[PDB]
Structures are given as C-alpha cells and as structure tokens.
Amino acid sequence: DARDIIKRPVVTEESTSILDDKKYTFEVDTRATKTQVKYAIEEIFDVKVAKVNVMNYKGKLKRMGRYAGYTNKRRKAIVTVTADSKEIQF
Amino acid sequence: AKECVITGRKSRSGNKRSHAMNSSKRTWKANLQKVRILVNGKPKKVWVSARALKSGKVE
Amino acid sequence: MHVKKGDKVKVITGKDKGKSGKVLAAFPKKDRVLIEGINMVKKHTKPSNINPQGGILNVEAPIHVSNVMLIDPKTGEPTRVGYEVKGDKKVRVAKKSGEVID
Amino acid sequence: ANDIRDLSTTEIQDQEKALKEELFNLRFQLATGQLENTARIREVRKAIARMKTIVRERE
RNA sequence: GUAUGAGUAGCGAAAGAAGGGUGAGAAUCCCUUCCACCGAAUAUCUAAGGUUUCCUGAGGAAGGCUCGUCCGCUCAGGGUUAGUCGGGACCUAAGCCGAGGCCGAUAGGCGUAGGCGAUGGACAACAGGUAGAGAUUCCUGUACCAGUGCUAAUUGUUUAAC
RNA sequence: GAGCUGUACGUAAGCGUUGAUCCAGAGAUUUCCGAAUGGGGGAACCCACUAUCUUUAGUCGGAUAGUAUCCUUACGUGAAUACAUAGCGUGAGGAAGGCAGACCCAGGGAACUGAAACAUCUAAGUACCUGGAGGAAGAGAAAGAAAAAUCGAUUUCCUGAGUAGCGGCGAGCGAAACGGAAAGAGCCCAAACCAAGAAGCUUGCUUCUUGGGGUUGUAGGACACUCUAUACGGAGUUACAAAAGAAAGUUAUAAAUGAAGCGGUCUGGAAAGGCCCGCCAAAGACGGUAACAGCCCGGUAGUUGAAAUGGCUUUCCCUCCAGAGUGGAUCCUGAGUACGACGGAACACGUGAAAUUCCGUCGGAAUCCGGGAGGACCAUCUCCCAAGGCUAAAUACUCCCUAGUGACCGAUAGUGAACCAGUACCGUGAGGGAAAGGUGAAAAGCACCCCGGAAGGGGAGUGAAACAGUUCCUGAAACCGUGUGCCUA
Numbered sequence: 005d006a007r008d009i010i011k012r013p014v015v016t017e018e019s020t021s022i023l024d025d026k027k028y029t030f031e032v033d034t035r036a037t038k039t040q041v042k043y044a045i046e047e048i049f050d051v052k053v054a055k056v057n058v059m060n061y062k063g064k065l066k067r068m069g070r071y072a073g074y075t076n077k078r079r080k081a082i083v084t085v086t087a088d089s090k091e092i093q094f
Numbered sequence: 095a096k097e098c099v100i101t102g103r104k105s106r107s108g109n110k111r112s113h114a115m116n117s118s119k120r121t122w123k124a125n126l127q128k129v130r131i132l133v134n135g136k137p138k139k140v141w142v143s144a145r146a147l148k149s150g151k152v153e
Numbered sequence: 154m155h156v157k158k159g160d161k162v163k164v165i166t167g168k169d170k171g172k173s174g175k176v177l178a179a180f181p182k183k184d185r186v187l188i189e190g191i192n193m194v195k196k197h198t199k200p201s202n203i204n205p206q207g208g209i210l211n212v213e214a215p216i217h218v219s220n221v222m223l224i225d226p227k228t229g230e231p232t233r234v235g236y237e238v239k240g241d242k243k244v245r246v247a248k249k250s251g252e253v254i255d
Numbered sequence: 256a257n258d259i260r261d262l263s264t265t266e267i268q269d270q271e272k273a274l275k276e277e278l279f280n281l282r283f284q285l286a287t288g289q290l291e292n293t294a295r296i297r298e299v300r301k302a303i304a305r306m307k308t309i310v311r312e313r314e
Numbered sequence: 315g316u317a318u319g320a321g322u323a324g325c326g327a328a329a330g331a332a333g334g335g336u337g338a339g340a341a342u343c344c345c346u347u348c349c350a351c352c353g354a355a356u357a358u359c360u361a362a363g364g365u366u367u368c369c370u371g372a373g374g375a376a377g378g379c380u381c382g383u384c385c386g387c388u389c390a391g392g393g394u395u396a397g398u399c400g401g402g403a404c405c406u407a408a409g410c411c412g413a414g415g416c417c418g419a420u421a422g423g424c425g426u427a428g429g430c431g432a433u434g435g436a437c438a439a440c441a442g443g444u445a446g447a448g449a450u451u452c453c454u455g456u457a458c459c460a461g462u463g464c465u466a467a468u469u470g471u472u473u474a475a476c
Numbered sequence: 477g478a479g480c481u482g483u484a485c486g487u488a489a490g491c492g493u494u495g496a497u498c499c500a501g502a503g504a505u506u507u508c509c510g511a512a513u514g515g516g517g518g519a520a521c522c523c524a525c526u527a528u529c530u531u532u533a534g535u536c537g538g539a540u541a542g543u544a545u546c547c548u549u550a551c552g553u554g555a556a557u558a559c560a561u562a563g564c565g566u567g568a569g570g571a572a573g574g575c576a577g578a579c580c581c582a583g584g585g586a587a588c589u590g591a592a593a594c595a596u597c598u599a600a601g602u603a604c605c606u607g608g609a610g611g612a613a614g615a616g617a618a619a620g621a622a623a624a625a626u627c628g629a630u631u632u633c634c635u636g637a638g639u640a641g642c643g644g645c646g647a648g649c650g651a652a653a654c655g656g657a658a659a660g661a662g663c664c665c666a667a668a669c670c671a672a673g674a675a676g677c678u679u680g681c682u683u684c685u686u687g688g689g690g691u692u693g694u695a696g697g698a699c700a701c702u703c704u705a706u707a708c709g710g711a712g713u714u715a716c717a718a719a720a721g722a723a724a725g726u727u728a729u730a731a732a733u734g735a736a737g738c739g740g741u742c743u744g745g746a747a748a749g750g751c752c753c754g755c756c757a758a759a760g761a762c763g764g765u766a767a768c769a770g771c772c773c774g775g776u777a778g779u780u781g782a783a784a785u786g787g788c789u790u791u792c793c794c795u796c797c798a799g800a801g802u803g804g805a806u807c808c809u810g811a812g813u814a815c816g817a818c819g820g821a822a823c824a825c826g827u828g829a830a831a832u833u834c835c836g837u838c839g840g841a842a843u844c845c846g847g848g849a850g851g852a853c854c855a856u857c858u859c860c861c862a863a864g865g866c867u868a869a870a871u872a873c874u875c876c877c878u879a880g881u882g883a884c885c886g887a888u889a890g891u892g893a894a895c896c897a898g899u900a901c902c903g904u905g906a907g908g909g910a911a912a913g914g915u916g917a918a919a920a921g922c923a924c925c926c927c928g929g930a931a932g933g934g935g936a937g938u939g940a941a942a943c944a945g946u947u948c949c950u951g952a953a954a955c956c957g958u959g960u961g962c963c964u965a
C-alpha cells in the first residue's frame with residue numbers, strides 16, 4: 005500500500021523554496037507513521053531517504069451562506085534524501 | 095438471592111393496620127436458615143426454609 | 154417523450170401556432186423541446202470570453218412538448234403515434250396513414 | 256469485463272498493479288497542475304474495482 | 315409592527331502637537347520630529363482556558379458607542395517539522411472500577427486478587443543563524459542516550475566465561 | 477430506448493443505438509466508535525501477546541488468524557488429605573445489547589384532589605420505577621353453572637342494571653348467572669403393572685435409569701380372559717412426535733398495449749373559454765400544458781407480461797401409529813398437600829352472620845365402605861373428582877409498507893418543524909426551545925448611454941405587465957412626509 009500511504013505532493017511557495025535543499029513535501033494519510041512514509045517513498049521513487057518530519061493539521065471552519073463546516077484534516081510529511089541520491093522531479 | 099433453594103419462598107409485601115384502620119406498608123419474610131446440604135454430589139451452604147426442612151432434606 | 158431529437162415538428166398552440174421546425178435538443182426531465190426558428194428571445198449579454206463583443210443576441214427558447222405534433226414523412230400532416238413491434242425492433246407508426254414514420 | 260474472465264488469475268494482479276501505478280501518476284500530475292483530461296481518474300478506479308470483483312467472485 | 319419622551323440621557327477612568335504621504339473623501343490610516351504616561355509594571359516568559367483570532371494580498375454593505383482609506387471585521391491563498399522539550403509506550407497517592415466472593419422485593423450495594431489515576435518520583439543537547447508567518451524541532455558547528463550489523467584482536471565451553 | 481456525468485448554475489474533461497444514464501430481483505465490497513468482547517480509555521483514541529509469512533546486513537518495519545466474561549457440557553490435570561473433591565486448563569454449544577413514547581403479564585407502588593374541614597374511605601392498584609415477553613399476551617377442557625330441568629372448555633360483544641349488594645350506610649363503589657350473538661378443538665403426563673440394565677449391598681432384597689402400558693366420575697385403569705388389528709386403514713410439524721425434499725397453481729417486487737378534433741370562427745400575451753359543427757366511450761379517474769381539455773401530453777377502462785427472489789395453496793414424497801368387549805379377589809388414581817389458628821391481601825363485598833381465592837408463620841387429613849362444592853354451619857339430596865402440563869379462532873394495539881377516503885387545516889392555522897428543525901439560541905447538566913412559503917408562462921434576470929468611488933438613480937431594451945427588477949402575487953391600519961381650498965396670534 006505504498007501508493008496509499010502517499011497521497012499527493014504539496015506545491016506552495018515554502019515547499020518550492022525548499023525543493024532546492026533536497027526536501028520534498030507530501031500529503032500522507034492520517035494513520036501512517038514516519039517509518040511507513042520513509043519506506044513507501046523509497047519504494048515508489050527509488051531514492052535514499054535520510055530523514056522524515058511529520059505534522060498534523062486540523063480542519064478550518066468555513067461558511068458559504070447559512071451553512072458552516074470544516075475542511076479535511078491533513079498529515080504533512082517532509083522527506084529529505086541523502087546527498088548521494090537522485091531527485092524527485094515534481 | 096435471599097430465598098429458599100427448595101420451594102423458593104421469599105419476602106412479600108402487605109399492610110400493617112392499626113385500630114382506626116390506618117394503613118402502612120410492610121413485608122413478610124420466610125424463616126430461611128443457612129444449612130449445609132447436598133446440592134450435588136458435594137455439600138454446600140444455602141438458604142432453606144424451616145418448612146422445607148421438616149420432612150425430606152439431608153443436613 | 155413522444156418526440157425525439159432530429160424530428161420534424163408542427164406547432165399546435167402558442168404564439169407560433171401553425172409553424173414547423175426541427176428538434177435541436179430534448180429535455181425529458183423538465184419536459185421541454187428546443188425547435189429551430191421557434192420562440193425566439195433577445196438576451197442582453199455583457200461582453201465575455203464567449204461572445205467577445207456581447208449585445209442583444211437573438212436565440213431560441215424551449216417550449217412544452219404538448220404543443221407539438223409529429224409530421225408524417227409522406228402524408229405530411231400531424232398524427233398521433235402508435236407503436237408496432239416489426240421484426241426485432243419496436244417502431245413508431247402514424248395512426249392516420251397507418252404507416253411507419255421511422 | 257468478459258475479456259477479464261479470460262485471464263489466469265495471476266496476470267489479473269499484474270493488471271491491478273499497473274493500474275494502481277497509473278492512478279498514482281495521474282494524481283501526481285493533477286496536484287502539480289499538468290493533467291489535461293481528468294476523466295481518466297474514474298476509468299482507472301472503476302477498472303481496478305472490477306478486477307477486484309472478478310478475483311473475489313472466483314473463490 | 316409603529317409612535318411619545320427627543321435630536322433629549324449617554325458615547326465606559328488617562329496628553330497631545332505640527333509637518334510630510336495615501337486616497338473620491340482624513341482630528342481618527344502610514345512616516346518624521348517634539349512632548350507626555352507606566353516601569354515588583356501598563357515590561358519579558360509560561361500553565362489553564364479559547365480554538366485559526368496567526369501571515370500575505372484584496373475590501374469597506376453590516377460589526378467597531380464618532381470617523382475610517384483602518385481592524386481581533388469580510389473574501390482568497392498560506393502557516394505549526396523533536397531519540398534528548400511536555401505527555402504516552404515507566405511508577406505510584408487520594409479517589410475510582412472491580413473475576414470469583416458477601417449482602418439484598420427487582421434494580422442493585424459493598425468488596426479481594428487485579429487494574430486505572432498527577433497536582434508528586436525516575437529519565438539522554440547545547441551555542442549561534444534564520445526580514446511574511448515555526449524553532450533546545452529547520453540549518454551550521456560540537457555532543458550525549460539506547461540499540462544493531464560488519465570488521466580486528468582477546469577469551470570460554472557443561473566442576474562450567476558470562 | 478436517447479440521451480447522460482444529483483441538489484446545482486457554471487466551467488473543464490468525457491461517455492452513449494457495439495445500446496449508456498435510469499428501473500426491479502439477486503450477489504460482492506462494507507474504515508473507525510458503539511453490547512464492543514486482546515488490555516486500557518476523557519466516543520470515534522492509545523498500547524499489546526501467540527502462531528505462520530515477509531523486508532533489511534541487521535536492529536527498525538509490514539501481512540494474516542487467534543486472544544473478554546458468565547452458563548451447560550466432554551476430556552485432562554489436581555490441594556490441605558490416603559481415596560477423593562475444590563481448584564486449574566482445553567474443546568464444543570448458548571447468552572449479553574437495542575427498541576414502536578403503542579398493545580400484556582408480573583414485582584414494587586404515591587400524592588394533589590373528593591368527602592364543601594378531616595384520620596376510615598376516595599383518587600387508585602392510577603402515575604411512575606423494575607423484570608419477562610409475543611405478534612398478540614392472558615384464560616382454557618368442570619373437585620363448574622345450577623335447582624320440580626337441566627346445561628356441558630375458554631375468550632369477546634348485547635342485555636341483566638345503575639339492579640342485588642358494599643359503604644364515617646357519608647362521599648361514593650358496584651357484580652354475576654340465566655337469555656341473544658362472534659368463534660369453535662381437543663389432548664399429553666404421574667401412579668398400578670410389564671422388560672432390560674446399574675448402583676447400594678436396605679446382604680437375594682430396595683432404588684436409579686431407559687422402553688412399553690395408562691389417564692377417569694354412568695367412576696376409570698392395572699389385572700384376567702375373549703375378538704380384530706402391526707400398515708388393510710389412519711394421522712402429521714397451529715396443541716395432539718419430529719426433520720426434510722419435489723412438482724403444479726396463484727400472488728408480490730420492474731413493465732407492455734391501449735379509442736376519439738392540429739374542426740371553423742371571436743376576444744386575447746397565450747384558448748382548455750364564447751358561438752357554430754363533429755367523434756369516442758367496458759375509457760367523462762387524476763394531473764400537466766401560456767386562461768376552465770373525454771378527443772394535446774402522462775395516462776384511464778379493458779387486455780397482456782417475469783429471468784430472479786419471497787409468500788401462500790394443493791398433490792407427491794417423507795415420518796409416525798393397536799381398539800373393541802365381558803368380569804370385579806387384589807392393586808393404583810398427584811402429602812408436609814388439602815385444611816385449621818394467627819397476621820395480611822384479592823374477590824362489587826371496608827370482618828362482617830362471610831362462603832370463595834392467594835401470601836408469610838405454626839399445626840396438620842382421608843384415600844372409593846374415599847374426597848370437594850351448592851355464600852356461617854348441620855342433616856338429606858344434587859352436581860363434580862383438587863393438590864401435574866399443553867392448546868388455534870373469535871379480542872387489544874400501530875413504529876411501518878401499499879391503495880385510498882374526509883359538510884379536516886390552509887402559513888399567528890395544520891405537527892415544535894410546508895423553508896438544511898429538535899436546527900439557531902439559552903443552560904455546568906438533566907433539560908427548554910424559535911423565526912422563516914409566493915418574480916414571470918418562459919430568465920426572455922435590464923446590451924448600450926448618462927451622474928456617482930460605490931450604492932442608488934434617469935433613459936434605452938425584454939415582457940401582457942418593471943408602479944412584476946432576484947424579502948419579487950395582492951398590499952389594509954397605526955406611523956412618517958410634500959402640496960394645497962377654508963379657519964386661526
């Protein structure tokens with residue numbers, strides 16, 4: 005379930021800025037651990053992972069007229085690869 | 095669980111009356127004694143009424 | 154519905170009574186039909202990516218399907234329709250001329 | 256669907272793996288902003304689902 | 315629903331002034347200078363509690379006891395990184411639950427073994443940098459704790475290293 | 477059978493006569509919490525153990541299955557303590573929780589109120605709490621009702637009757653049988669005896685199990701003999717024993733077909749309306765369509781249709797089966813039971829002259845030459861046979877599904893809720909609890925010009941209508957204004 009642990013990449017200004025330091029930002033499902041993310045990345049992309057950091061994000065309250073709800077929760081991972089390794093294109 | 099194991103009689107409610115016939119609630123209890131009998135091939139202590147005890151059981 | 158896309162239509166009631174046209178679209182969920190040259194409206198449209206210049210555009214609007222009758226491909230008069238299973242297909246049949254419309 | 260039933264229950268899972276890889280690449284392109292036709296997502300998802308259905312009902 | 319009281323009471327402790335700017339519009343927004351107030355606080359951290367109020371770009375109907383070009387307000391995008399910090403995977407106090415058990419019209423009450431439960435005990439990381447928003451977490455230097463494999467020597471074999 | 481990717485516009489990308497979207501039956505998938513069940517927990521979270529496998533150079537990681545408690549049962553181990561039991565372990569079966577705010581059975585059980593005060597009494601075995609259910613429950617085949625003569629298991633309805641009675645004889649409470657109906661159905665044990673086995677040794681005996689036999693009041697059965705009968709016949713899963721399998725039919729859950737006016741003319745934005753002519757009808761139900769339609773549309777009466785699954789009814793299959801008579805030695809026919817005293821309760825019946833039924837506590841029978849009842853009790857007579865069990869229908873109710881109905885409401889009404897309502901909001905919590913429908917037939921929802929930062933206007937245009945302009949049908953009164961005929965310091 006490597007393709008299930010990793011959902012999609014994250015493309016913002018901060019992630020694009022850190023792309024040059026060999027750090028890649030991904031959205032992962034909310035039950036995966038760091039180790040699972042590391043092994044899923046190494047299997048999908050054929051790189052050598054040096055480190056993974058993770059964080060959790062709550063949903064944001066939103067309104068579109070008389071109706072209020074929340075966006076989805078998110079789990080965000082940053083993966084840094086070793087110096088002697090290829091890169092992910094994005 | 096406070097009741098006879100043979101002919102399982104226990105407490106029941108009723109009225110206490112006075113002269114002038116005022117009515118109040120009370121209970122009647124059975125006189126269960128704690129005795130050691132053979133519920134199986136083995137003995138044990140149980141509640142048995144004194145009525146169920148005057149012909150038939152083995153103490 | 155009783156009228157299909159690509160059919161010939163005689164308009165039975167309304168402001169365009171007595172005219173004829175062709176079915177350009179059908180809306181069975183709301184029970185309307187779009188017919189060429191029939192029931193023209195004028196839309197005041199601001200300039201947009203579609204319609205680059207905008208203006209008073211004269212286009213067509215749907216009408217109710219009950220204001221419509223089929224035109225026989227040969228006799229050429231409005232007919233009620235029946236259904237006859239001829240061969241491996243059920244086909245529509247003109248109920249005046251007693252012939253197959255399809 | 257009927258041509259899926261002609262496969263030998265081992266190439267079926269190779270097809271499943273290939274479809275999963277294609278679906279992941281499609282979502283990567285959609286996130287990056289480089290996917291032209293988006294109707295492919297539904298097709299791939301339904302194809303995987305029917306592979307799984309046919310494998311399961313063969314037991 | 316709408317009057318009268320009535321353009322009346324009030325506008326919630328306090329020092330401001332001028333010159334530039336922006337803008338349709340400025341006592342009220344931005345910048346400069348001068349003046350004034352707190353200073354065992356009206357300063358700096360941090361628990362609780364709140365839950366996106368945080369940053370950036372747009373906005374000015376309503377909210378803000380006045381005004382507003384502004385805002386803790388509206389809209390759209392972002393933002394929270396830990397082997398060592400605080401908690402769990404460690405421990406127990408008050409208290410709570412409680413197999414069997416004891417008691418009792420029913421429902422249940424009490425209680426042993428056992429287990430939960432910090433406000434307490436134990437336990438390994440420091441100094442710098444970071445101009446939109448995180449920092450003992452990221453990065454740069456230099457460490458420590460627990461483990462694992464692989465090498466190289468040493469040593470021990472059931473009066474028995476460990 | 478031609479469009480489709482919901483509300484829901486739109487953009488984007490696509491799919492369908494090689495038959496999509498859609499409708500009905502049957503399957504597969506079905507995260508986490510919750511009886512929640514591997515352990516814990518502040519709901520949807522945290523942390524495991526045991527087997528088998530997998531990845532890595534190895535720690536690190538991953539997959540699958542099992543792992544709660546109690547009851548019943550089989551096997552195994554096993555203490556004080558010798559045999560043994562308790563305890564411990566494994567396996568196999570079962571339970572647990574919810575609800576339709578209804579209906580019914582049981583355990584427990586108020587007060588306000590009425591009595592023009594109040595305590596007996598009433599309210600009332602009501603409200604409420606708790607436990608068991610079932611599609612119904614409960615009751616039920618006479619130890620009955622009766623009385624110059626009989627009836628023949630229960631239940632429900634009409635009468636009896638506000639009668640007979642009960643009652644600080646106050647307030648009040650209040651039957652039953654006979655008579656008329658709905659519906660109807662009857663049966664298994666225990667015990668005498670037979671046969672077999674086992675335990676104790678009650679030591680040649682009793683007592684335990686299994687099978688057969690047998691269930692009643694004119695007494696019946698065991699027991700003796702006659703007659704027939706072992707499937708000739710009979711019965712059955714709704715009691716009377718219990719579990720299956722086929723075929724035919726019908727019905728339910730999608731559907732198909734289906735007559736007759738584009739008739740002329742007037743008004744109109746539009747004809748289904750008016751006037752003048754036709755037609756269909758086993759079809760003049762209902763709804764829609766630019767105004768009021770049997771003949772425009774969906775349909776309606778009639779006639780058809782089912783691959784699949786469900787229900788019901790028959791037939792087959794399957795399964796199970798002794799019943800008459802004549803006798804009167806001996807034997808059997810429900811024991812701490814029936815009854816009685818004391819204390820209570822239920823009976824319409826408040827202890828009363830109090831029968832009848834039940835509970836607690838004590839005492840305590842007879843057994844066919846026997847026992848119970850007939851409202852204290854005795855004698856006579858009459859009727860019946862307790863202390864074991866099962867049983868359909870007629871009766872009660874509606875969270876639901878299908879088809880309909882109403883001298884029922886019409887947005888302050890009708891549900892609290894016609895609208896994203898048990899929501900917003902209030903409260904620590906249990907809990908309380910709103911307001912809010914209508915453009916137009918069709919968005920044709922006002923291109924363009926002008927004043928203004930915008931909002932908002934004035935034209936122009938659409939429309940039948942804009943004094944219908946996205947709180948939009950109509951648009952009363954209060955209340956706020958502008959203008960003016962007559963009066964007023």
Ligand SMILES: [Mg+2]
Pocket residue numbers: 038039042056
């Ligand atoms: Mg890791």
Ligand SMILES: [Mg+2]
Pocket residue numbers: 059060
């Ligand atoms: Mg975290």
Ligand SMILES: [Mg+2]
Pocket residue numbers: 060061062
């Ligand atoms: Mg978070």
Ligand SMILES: [Mg+2]
Pocket residue numbers: 059060061062394
């Ligand atoms: Mg975060």
Ligand SMILES: [Mg+2]
Pocket residue numbers: 117
């Ligand atoms: Mg009383």
Ligand SMILES: [Mg+2]
Pocket residue numbers: 124125126143144145146
């Ligand atoms: Mg006793």
Ligand SMILES: [Mg+2]
Pocket residue numbers: 144145148
């Ligand atoms: Mg005694």
Ligand SMILES: [Mg+2]
Pocket residue numbers: none
């Ligand atoms: Mg006022």
Ligand SMILES: [Mg+2]
Pocket residue numbers: none
């Ligand atoms: Mg100034």
Ligand SMILES: [Mg+2]
Pocket residue numbers: none
């Ligand atoms: Mg906010």
Ligand SMILES: [Mg+2]
Pocket residue numbers: 377378
């Ligand atoms: Mg304000």
Ligand SMILES: [Mg+2]
Pocket residue numbers: 325379
């Ligand atoms: Mg003010």
Ligand SMILES: [Mg+2]
Pocket residue numbers: 337383
């Ligand atoms: Mg401005």
Ligand SMILES: [Mg+2]
Pocket residue numbers: none
């Ligand atoms: Mg803001």
Ligand SMILES: [Mg+2]
Pocket residue numbers: none
């Ligand atoms: Mg930590």
Ligand SMILES: [Mg+2]
Pocket residue numbers: none
């Ligand atoms: Mg622990």
